Amino acid sequence: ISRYAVPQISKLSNGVRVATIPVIGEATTLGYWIKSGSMYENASNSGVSHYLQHVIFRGNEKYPQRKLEQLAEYEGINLMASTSRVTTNFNATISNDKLDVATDVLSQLVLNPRIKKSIVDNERDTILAEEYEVSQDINEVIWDKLHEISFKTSIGFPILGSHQSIQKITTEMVQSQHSNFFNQDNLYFVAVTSLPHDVILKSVEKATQFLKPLASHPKLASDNDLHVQKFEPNQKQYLLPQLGDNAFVAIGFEAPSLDSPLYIPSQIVKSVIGSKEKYSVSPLIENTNIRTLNSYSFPYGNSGLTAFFGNESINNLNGWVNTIFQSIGTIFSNENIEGSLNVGRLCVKSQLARGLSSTRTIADELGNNLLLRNEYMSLGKWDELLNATNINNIKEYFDKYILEKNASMVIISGKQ
Amino acid sequence: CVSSVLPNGIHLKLMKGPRGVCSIGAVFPIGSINSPKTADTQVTLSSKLVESLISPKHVFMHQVYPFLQVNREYSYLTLQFLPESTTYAIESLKRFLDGAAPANTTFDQQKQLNYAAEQLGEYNLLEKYKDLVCMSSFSNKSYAHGNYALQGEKIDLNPQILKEIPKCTTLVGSIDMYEELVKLGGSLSPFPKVKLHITSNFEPNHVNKNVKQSSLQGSKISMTSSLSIMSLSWPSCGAKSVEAPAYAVLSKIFGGGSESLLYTKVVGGVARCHQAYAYNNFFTTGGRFNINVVAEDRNLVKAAQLVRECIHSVETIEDKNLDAARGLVKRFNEFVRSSYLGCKPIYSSQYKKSIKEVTRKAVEKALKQTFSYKPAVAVYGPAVPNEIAKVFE
Ligand SMILES: [Zn+2]
Numbered sequence A: 001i002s003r004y005a006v007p008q009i010s011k012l013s014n015g016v017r018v019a020t021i022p023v024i025g026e027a028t029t030l031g032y033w034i035k036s037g038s039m040y041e042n043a044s045n046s047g048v049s050h051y052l053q054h055v056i057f058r059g060n061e062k063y064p065q066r067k068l069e070q071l072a073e074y075e076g077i078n079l080m081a082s083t084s085r086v087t088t089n090f091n092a093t094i095s096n097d098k099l100d101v102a103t104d105v106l107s108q109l110v111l112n113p114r115i116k117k118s119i120v121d122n123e124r125d126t127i128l129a130e131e132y133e134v135s136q137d138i139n140e141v142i143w144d145k146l147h148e149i150s151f152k153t154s155i156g157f158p159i160l161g162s163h164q165s166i167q168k169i170t171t172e173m174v175q176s177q178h179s180n181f182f183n184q185d186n187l188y189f190v191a192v193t194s195l196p197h198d199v200i201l202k203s204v205e206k207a208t209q210f211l212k213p214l215a216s217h218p219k220l221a222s223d224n225d226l227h228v229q230k231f232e233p234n235q236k237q238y239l240l241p242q243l244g245d246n247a248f249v250a251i252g253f254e255a256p257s258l259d260s261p262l263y264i265p266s267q268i269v270k271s272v273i274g275s276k277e278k279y280s281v282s283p284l285i286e287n288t289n290i291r292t293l294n295s296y297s298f299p300y301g302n303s304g305l306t307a308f309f310g311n312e313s314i315n316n317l318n319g320w321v322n323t324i325f326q327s328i329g330t331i332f333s334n335e336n337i338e339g340s341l342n343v344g345r346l347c348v349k350s351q352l353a354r355g356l357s358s359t360r361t362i363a364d365e366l367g368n369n370l371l372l373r374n375e376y377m378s379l380g381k382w383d384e385l386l387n388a389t390n391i392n393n394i395k396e397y398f399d400k401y402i403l404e405k406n407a408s409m410v411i412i413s414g415k416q
Numbered sequence B: 001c002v003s004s005v006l007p008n009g010i011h012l013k014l015m016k017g018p019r020g021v022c023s024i025g026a027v028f029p030i031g032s033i034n035s036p037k038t039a040d041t042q043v044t045l046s047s048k049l050v051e052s053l054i055s056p057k058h059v060f061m062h063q064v065y066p067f068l069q070v071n072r073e074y075s076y077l078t079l080q081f082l083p084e085s086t087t088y089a090i091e092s093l094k095r096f097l098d099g100a101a102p103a104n105t106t107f108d109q110q111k112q113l114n115y116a117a118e119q120l121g122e123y124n125l126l127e128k129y130k131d132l133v134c135m136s137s138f139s140n141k142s143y144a145h146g147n148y149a150l151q152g153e154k155i156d157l158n159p160q161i162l163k164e165i166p167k168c169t170t171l172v173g174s175i176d177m178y179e180e181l182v183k184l185g186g187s188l189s190p191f192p193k194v195k196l197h198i199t200s201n202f203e204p205n206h207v208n209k210n211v212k213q214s215s216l217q218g219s220k221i222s223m224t225s226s227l228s229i230m231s232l233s234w235p236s237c238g239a240k241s242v243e244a245p246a247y248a249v250l251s252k253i254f255g256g257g258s259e260s261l262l263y264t265k266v267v268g269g270v271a272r273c274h275q276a277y278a279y280n281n282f283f284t285t286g287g288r289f290n291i292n293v294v295a296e297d298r299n300l301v302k303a304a305q306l307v308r309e310c311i312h313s314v315e316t317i318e319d320k321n322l323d324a325a326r327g328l329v330k331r332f333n334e335f336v337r338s339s340y341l342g343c344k345p346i347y348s349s350q351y352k353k354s355i356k357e358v359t360r361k362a363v364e365k366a367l368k369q370t371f372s373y374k375p376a377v378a379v380y381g382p383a384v385p386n387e388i389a390k391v392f393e
Helices: A048-057 A065-073 A096-111 A117-134 A138-150 A163-168 A171-181 A197-207 A263-273 A314-332 A337-355 A359-372 A379-387 A391-401 B040-052 B056-061 B083-096 B104-115 B125-134 B159-164 B175-186 B244-254 B261-267 B297-313 B319-328 B332-340 B349-356 B360-371 B385-390
Strands: A008-011 A017-022 A027-034 A079-083 A088-095 A187-193 A235-239 A246-254 A294-300 A303-313 A408-413 B002-005 B011-015 B022-028 B065-070 B075-081 B170-174 B206-209 B228-235 B273-282 B287-295 B376-380
Touching: A008 A197, A017 A197, A017 A359, A027 A096, A027 A359, A048 A079, A048 A088, A048 A096, A048 A117, A048 A171, A065 A079, A065 A096, A065 B319, A088 A096, A088 A359, A096 A187, A096 A197, A117 A163, A117 A171, A138 A235, A138 A246, A138 A303, A138 A408, A187 A197, A187 A359, A246 A314, A263 A294, A263 A303, A263 A314, A263 A337, A263 A379, A263 A391, A303 A314, A314 A337, A314 A391, A314 A408, A337 A359, A337 A379, A337 A391, A337 B056, B011 B175, B011 B332, B022 B083, B022 B175, B022 B332, B040 B065, B040 B075, B040 B083, B040 B104, B040 B159, B065 B332, B075 B083, B075 B332, B083 B175, B125 B206, B125 B228, B125 B273, B125 B287, B125 B376, B170 B175, B170 B332, B206 B385, B228 B297, B228 B360, B244 B261, B244 B273, B244 B287, B244 B319, B244 B349, B244 B360, B261 B273, B261 B297, B273 B297, B287 B297, B297 B385, B319 B360, B376 B385
Parallel strands: A017 A187, A235 A408, B011 B170, B206 B376
Antiparallel strands: A008 A017, A027 A088, A027 A187, A079 A088, A246 A303, A246 A408, A294 A303, B002 B011, B022 B075, B022 B170, B065 B075, B228 B287, B228 B376, B273 B287
16 A cells, blocks of 8 residues: 655654655545653653553543543544553544544643643552552563563663552643653654645644644653663563463573664564464474464663564473574575575565565654654665575574573473 | 356355465355364364365465464455465365365364363454353354363364365455466366255344363463353344344444443443443344343342443434444455355445444334344353343333
């Protein structure tokens, strides 16, 4: 649905940048992408980015909670938001005729909140509950433990905040995070749309009429260099006897930053191991009977984490670990390096192609690209880079990141 | 959509829309009811599917996303891929339509996965609702055959249904797979079989699937594994009916959530009640409107009373509510689902026309004819079903 090149960016005199990319279709995804998340927090305000996201959604003056509900129910404006370790967005997916109401609400909520003790305190329980829910998905739990033992720095915080943190978050903290991270210069408004650029631009201008320009530009709190991350491999085991005859396991390595020449290779290697699904497993895996497998690799400022995880029966856990290590090893062998690269490259192209049919997916990618990249990377240039990636690029990623490196490991066991 | 009929009688149905991801598949009137017992069909088609793809490694290496959906009266297979994988996808679809029984060793593997379905996260609440509705609201006892075996029970390979697939297959695919499918269907034998498929009559039976749930389901320590599920079924209409939009609307009025009337009066109303949802299930010739409640075993009767209280409430319903409902109402999978049923796809321009076009007449009419019946009552758990049934008079 996207014709595989380039977005168009304009800046309003109030300093809001409006980035749109053209798409065919009835559908439009739009909103605000802000460089706000748990990487930019410290021990004392951990959890606050996510907390703020909730408050923002709980309505402001011109739109209380009630008028937001009405807008879902009758006027077809569905508000989505989320907070990762690195970024935050508030968005809606709409029909083109709903443009003005959408840009109005979104600008109002994100850029014009009313952060009062009563909404803050009233939100606490919701966030507590969400934290309980999330803690009963062991994949989430193990993900988080693996970060925690690998990073002494802010990446090792959970996104939601520790239980104690969620309990101690004050209205002052929520205010401050908004004041420091939600400014024109730390965000973009994004639109994936058939409508021309200028129509979105004019709509956002109408919508942001209340917003006064910034007098100065104090160095962004979201700056990567104010949050240098330090990976240190660690090994830690947990009980959860309610799991019964099962264990979860995760194995982590440091991964490259988003701009490293070795990033793409890292993506190829992870992809080639990939995930085991109902009908598909990596040629690299010797025991295809393993219960499950996931592979992720993320950039975090200067650092990043590649992680492999799943669950097996207690009897099968230690085997699972051997399988995963073998599989990685297999890639480095000269009998295999070339097939590994081509299959990994194919995987990455295939993940791409799927993301290019949903405006929601295009939006998220465009938002993150703009906020997290040095220079905007085209779907175009990206393809070139993948294709130009050779056996020696893979060999080199292995050298800097894998061979002779200790991995982090977390086990969560039912009996052990 | 673009219908065709082939030289040899084979129907072929194409999804319009953009290029990028390629789609192919087969849909056919063989479902779980066409095997002697639960899981028989499921495991047979799974075995056949896994042999057809050669190995999970081939699947992976070509980046093919296979999907197999076995329903009561019908089933479908879909494959999604990038254009450079066309040959493997087409050949794998061909092998699937070749009538040959899968080797026992494969069956035994698939049996293992099937028995472990709840633990692996393949047997969620949606799947349990369907099972509960199908073992309770049919005059025919064959509808009680689901896809997921009980721990105590046998599962056998059904080689006859494999011979039958090619003889009743409609082919489905994205528009750009026209040429490739025309040739594939070309290879199937003339002419497709024609059976009369009549969905079984409504019966308000009372049943229990009184079975332990796994603690761990997929990667979740299930927050519902100790609670019971109560399914209440009433007859509605077939997918092709002109009343089907009215019923979709009626389901959203009832609505529901976890932690709309089912939310407010039922999830709010019984403390220690995880969730309450109303769904509308279509079949070849009939429907089942069903309301499902996850609550403590001892709380089910109270919950039923709140649902009866809830049905009552729908007569005196405002236009604010009646507009919210109209509002509130792997896209290939919907194209295929709605291609068999012969209706309009949930995403199509024509379907959302219908939803705008439902009168208040239509809704109260649908309500009246549906709730005129004594509900069928099923329990995932030990709750006495006739007790809950008593609530309805
Ligand atoms: Zn949240």
